[PDB]
């Protein structure tokens, strides 16, 4: 099948490499028992979504929970923790990323479960402090559950991994939560719109704000 692969990556050395080389780095540490049953499943250009409707990869609504504010995220995109050119095998492994998540080349996201009224996997401390729920509409990425199947360590997370990061042009919006209570919905003006996307999930009470570089209210964190 055809896949955009690492089109969303912000790290330059991952962006330059061939998909077979990046695929090797993700799968090289997999045990023989895992290799027998599992395959490295990149999200295809046309995929079956969580509500069993066939959509393009860029129309699958992904989400990333993060405590960093819009002034970081809409400026730089999502940069992974490990960006160096010669990482360890633990830092490039998809299975260890899925199982443990120690500092790695991947940026984790979760799929919108559209069969359950746009539910997403929520971390336990989402309602503590200042937290942002970033809305992502990106190409490529590695589907974790499709890859490992029954051997997927935490399938409730519904992970789509992005080795080398996610560019800021694929992030549409961000819901600013203060102790699990919505304050604002940030709008990314540099979002490359693929068309046919549903409206941003918002009440009449919640004020929507268009972001710019060094926004006055756009750098709130713990
Ligand atoms: N982020 C999500 O919404 C999401 C989605 C699905 C699964 N998970 C799982 O939940 C757990 C938590 O993941 P996570 O996303 O918080 O882990 P992470 O490695 O992305 O980051 C851990 C901490 O580092 C910060 N951080 C990340 N990249 C940074 C950078 N470049 N510079 C500075 N700080 C940076 C994050 O804000 C966070 O506080 C993992 O097991 C992950 O697999 C998370």
């Amino acid at each position: 099948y055809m896949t955009n692969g690492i089109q969303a990556a912000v790290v330059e050395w991952i962006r330059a490499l061939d998909l077979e080389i990046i695929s090797l780095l993700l799968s090289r540490a997999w045990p023989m028992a895992l290799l027998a049953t599992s395959e490295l499943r990149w999200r295809p250009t046309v995929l079956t979504d969580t509500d069993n409707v066939v959509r393009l990869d860029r129309r699958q609504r992904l989400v990333r929970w993060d405590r960093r504010p819009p002034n970081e995220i809409f400026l730089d995109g999502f940069v992974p923790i490990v960006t160096r050119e010669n990482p360890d095998w633990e830092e490039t492994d998809l299975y260890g990323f899925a199982k443990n998540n120690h500092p790695s080349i991947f940026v984790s996201t979760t799929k919108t479960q559209r069969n359950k009224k746009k539910y997403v996997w929520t971390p336990r401390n989402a309602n503590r402090g200042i937290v942002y729920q970033y809305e992502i509409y990106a190409p490529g990425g590695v589907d974790v559950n499709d890859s490992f199947s029954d051997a997927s360590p935490w399938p409730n997370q519904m992970q789509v991994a992005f080795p080398g990061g996610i560019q800021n042009i694929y992030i549409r919006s961000a819901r600013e939560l203060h102790n699990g209570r919505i304050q604002r919905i940030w709008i990314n003006p540099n979002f490359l719109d693929p068309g046919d996307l549903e409206p941003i999930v918002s009440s009449s009470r919640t004020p929507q704000v268009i972001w710019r570089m060094n926004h006055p209210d756009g750098g709130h964190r713990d």
Side-chain angles (χ1 to χ4, degrees):
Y1 60 92
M2 301 213 74
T3 183
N4 291 318
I6 44 66
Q7 190 176 25
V10 301
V11 177
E12 296 188 343
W13 73 268
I14 294 160
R15 180 160 201 74
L17 286 161
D18 195 283
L19 193 63
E20 294 189 335
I21 301 299
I22 301 301
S23 294
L24 182 145
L25 297 169
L26 274 39
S27 58
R28 62 183 172 178
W30 291 10
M32 294 300 303
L34 195 67
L35 287 162
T37 56
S38 309
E39 185 172 31
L40 189 65
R41 292 282 288 282
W42 294 90
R43 289 201 304 170
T45 52
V46 186
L47 51 70
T48 306
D49 215 323
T50 54
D51 66 339
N52 304 330
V53 177
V54 176
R55 297 199 181 79
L56 300 177
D57 60 343
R58 283 216 64 205
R59 305 213 172 99
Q60 188 168 57
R61 189 178 176 280
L62 301 178
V63 163
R64 184 173 162 76
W65 298 90
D66 207 310
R67 292 186 175 280
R68 295 174 289 167
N71 289 358
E72 264 201 66
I73 300 302
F74 293 176
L75 182 56
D76 303 331
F78 285 114
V79 187
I81 294 163
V82 186
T83 58
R84 67 204 173 83
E85 298 188 330
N86 198 335
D88 298 320
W89 69 267
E90 295 97 321
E91 300 177 317
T92 62
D93 184 34
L94 188 70
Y95 184 71
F97 158 79
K99 193 168 184 171
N100 309 129
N101 195 88
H102 297 117
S104 65
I105 66 168
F106 304 98
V107 169
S108 58
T109 64
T110 183
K111 297 183 185 169
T112 302
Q113 300 175 42
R114 292 180 64 170
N115 60 326
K116 310 177 195 297
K117 281 209 171 191
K118 310 192 194 190
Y119 176 83
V120 287
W121 174 88
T122 308
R124 68 188 67 197
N125 301 326
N127 68 330
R128 285 199 177 79
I130 299 168
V131 179
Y132 298 89
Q133 192 198 83
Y134 290 91
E135 190 185 38
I136 298 161
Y137 287 105
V142 181
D143 196 309
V144 177
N145 291 355
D146 293 352
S147 294
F148 302 121
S149 301
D150 298 324
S152 187
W154 309 111
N156 63 311
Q157 296 180 357
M158 301 286 286
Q159 274 198 135
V160 182
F162 288 89
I166 310 177
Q167 287 167 40
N168 59 0
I169 62 166
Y170 305 118
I171 309 164
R172 192 167 79 167
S173 61
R175 294 165 63 83
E176 181 171 349
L177 305 176
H178 283 216
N179 299 332
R181 303 183 72 77
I182 192 158
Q183 305 299 122
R184 285 181 292 283
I185 297 165
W186 297 92
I187 312 299
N188 188 22
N190 303 316
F191 177 69
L192 183 65
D193 201 317
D196 293 19
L197 302 182
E198 292 189 314
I200 295 160
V201 176
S202 181
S203 302
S204 189
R205 305 186 224 288
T206 312
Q208 300 184 11
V209 185
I210 302 166
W211 179 86
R212 63 181 179 282
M213 187 165 61
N214 300 25
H215 195 268
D217 304 320
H220 298 142
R221 65 177 78 187
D222 298 327

